[PDB]
Amino acid sequence: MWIGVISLFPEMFKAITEFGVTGRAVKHNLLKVECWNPRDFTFDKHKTVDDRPYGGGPGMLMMVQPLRDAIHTAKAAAGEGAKVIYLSPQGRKLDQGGVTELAQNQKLILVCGRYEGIDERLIQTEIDEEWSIGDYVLTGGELPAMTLIDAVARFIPGVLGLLDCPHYTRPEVLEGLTVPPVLMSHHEEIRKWRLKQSLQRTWLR
Amino acid sequence: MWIGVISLFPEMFKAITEFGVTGRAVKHNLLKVECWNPRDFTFDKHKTVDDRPYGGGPGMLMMVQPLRDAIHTAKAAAGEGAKVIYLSPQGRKLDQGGVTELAQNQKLILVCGRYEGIDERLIQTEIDEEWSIGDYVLTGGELPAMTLIDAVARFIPGVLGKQASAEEDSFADGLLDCPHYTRPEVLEGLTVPPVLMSGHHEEIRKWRLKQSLQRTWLRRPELLEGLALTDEQRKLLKEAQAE
Numbered sequence: 515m516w517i518g519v520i521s522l523f524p525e526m527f528k529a530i531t532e533f534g535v536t537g538r539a540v541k542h543n544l545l546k547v548e549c550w551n552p553r554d555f556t557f558d559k560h561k562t563v564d565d566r567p568y569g570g571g572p573g574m575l576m577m578v579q580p581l582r583d584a585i586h587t588a589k590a591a592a593g594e595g596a597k598v599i600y601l602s603p604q605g606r607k608l609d610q611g612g613v614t615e616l617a618q619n620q621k622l623i624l625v626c627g628r629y630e631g632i633d634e635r636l637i638q639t640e641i642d643e644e645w646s647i648g649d650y651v652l653t654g655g656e657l658p659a660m661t662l663i664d665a666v667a668r669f670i671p672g673v674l675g676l677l678d679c680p681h682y683t684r685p686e687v688l689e690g691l692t693v694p695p696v697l698m699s700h701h702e703e704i705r706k707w708r709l710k711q712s713l714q715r716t717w718l719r
Numbered sequence: 720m721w722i723g724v725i726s727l728f729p730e731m732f733k734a735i736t737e738f739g740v741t742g743r744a745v746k747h748n749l750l751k752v753e754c755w756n757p758r759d760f761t762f763d764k765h766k767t768v769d770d771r772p773y774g775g776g777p778g779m780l781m782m783v784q785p786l787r788d789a790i791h792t793a794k795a796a797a798g799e800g801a802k803v804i805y806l807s808p809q810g811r812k813l814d815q816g817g818v819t820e821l822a823q824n825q826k827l828i829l830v831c832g833r834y835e836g837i838d839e840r841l842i843q844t845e846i847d848e849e850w851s852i853g854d855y856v857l858t859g860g861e862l863p864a865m866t867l868i869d870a871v872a873r874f875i876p877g878v879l880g881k882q883a884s885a886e887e888d889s890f891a892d893g894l895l896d897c898p899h900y901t902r903p904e905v906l907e908g909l910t911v912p913p914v915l916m917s918g919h920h921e922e923i924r925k926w927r928l929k930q931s932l933q934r935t936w937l938r939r940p941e942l943l944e945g946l947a948l949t950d951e952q953r954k955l956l957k958e959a960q961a962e
């Protein structure tokens with residue numbers, strides 16, 4: 515799988531490409547993540563990446579020209595069939611069904627916004643889909659993009675409905691707490707199944 | 720605010736401490752994030768961090784001794800009053816109400832797990848709360864912990880600079896945001912809605928509010944279920960629905 519990323523902080527993506535299961539996927543050439551920074555597409559001395567909203571009010575938007583140019587460079591690296599995803603608080607809320615759908619794509623381009631977001635017309639001209647990772651306020655689209663990468667990477671071949679029952683490992687006595695004698699005795703898929711149901715009944719419905 | 724982290728991949732947290740809003744909060748001593756790795760608390764040549772579950776079945780659990788020792792080192796650095804959060808796929812699902820609650824803590828310890836998780840007794844003896852960031856499967860607790868840090872850091876006074884505080888900004892949190900536009904005037908032949916160029920503040924506010932209501936209704940109608948609307952919002956939503 516190939517993933518293109520547009521971000522003002524591309525170095526954040528080292529958390530994905532250098533470590534753990536995604537890092538191992540990168541090392542084994544099962545996953546490739548390439549980043550482009552709108553800052554690198556600026557023409558002015560101050561490398562301006564923000565711009566004022568028409569209609570006023572507080573907040574800024576991503577400046578159109580550096581952002582659009584970075585997207586175009588990612589699209590040229592991707593080639594045909596790359597789906598362009600805008601990480602947005604106004605997007606479809608990610609769940610495992612959404613992850614399964616997004617993981618059918620061999621190529622993705624993930625656009626990360628800063629400030630109050632991006633010009634509405636850029637959504638029409640450049641974006642295929644908008645996605646949120648949850649109903650909470652973040653400072654940008656980078657942690658959502660990284661979260662999406664990790665979730666979809668699990669679907670790449672070679673990379674790898676109730677509340678779980680409690681699980682125990684060594685020692686037998688931990689802070690005076692003992693392991694249920696049943697585990698250590700059989701199977702008996704319950705008490706494991708019975709505890710999984712008991713925990714589901716007493717805590718979440 | 721001080722945040723202690725337990726993780727097998729502590730270098731991932733540089734994405735938070737070295738960049739953007741959280742990075743500037745670190746540089747300005749408004750936020751401090753310290754990481755401890757259970758692999759640094761191992762005694763064996765192979766630095767073993769996993770262990771077999773009693774009763775068998777598939778999967779491994781994090782080994783108790785290196786994990787608990789790392790938690791204890793974070794607790795000793797924290798001092799009194801630190802709430803210990805375990806990031807887990809079955810914990811309380813994070814939302815803005817949960818963020819606001821978590822943001823009241825001056826000190827937090829975030830425990831990230833790998834494998835199938837941690838020994839039940841460790842939850843009982845070392846963990847205060849369990850939290851999830853969404854109904855999707857991830858490879859570990861690190862991206863959830865970083866997501867939690869970013870969300871709560873917005874509540875630290877001075878982190879949002881001279882702009883409105885997270886509290887003041889929350890006063891409009893119920894609905895999705897309206898579309899926004901910046902230069903150029905014409906982008907691929909597409910123009911900016913004329914009301915935004917009018918300099919008529921109330922007309923702009925009412926257009927943005929009507930758009931916000933229409934977008935919330937079409938994309939996330941569940942957000943409207945548990946929402947008290949003003950007379951104006953009710954009248955505008957009806958207009959957008961009739962158009």
Ligand SMILES: O=C(NCc1ccc(CNCc2ncc[nH]2)cc1)c1csc2nc[nH]c(=O)c12
Binds near residue numbers: 649651891
């Ligand atoms: O870009 C992202 N966040 C930056 C961001 C956050 C909020 C606003 C709107 N601020 C105006 C306001 N004040 C009160 C109500 N509305 C604009 C931009 C993001 C991408 S995916 C995702 N998934 C979950 N959460 C996220 O924040 C994200």
Ligand SMILES: O=C(NCc1ccc(CNCc2ncc[nH]2)cc1)c1csc2nc[nH]c(=O)c12
Binds near residue numbers: 778850852
């Ligand atoms: O630690 C986390 N994830 C790792 C993880 C995911 C699933 C399972 C269940 N094992 C099932 C299984 N066993 C064998 C095959 N499949 C265990 C651990 C996590 C922390 S907060 C969060 N919030 C949202 N999503 C997340 O994944 C998380």
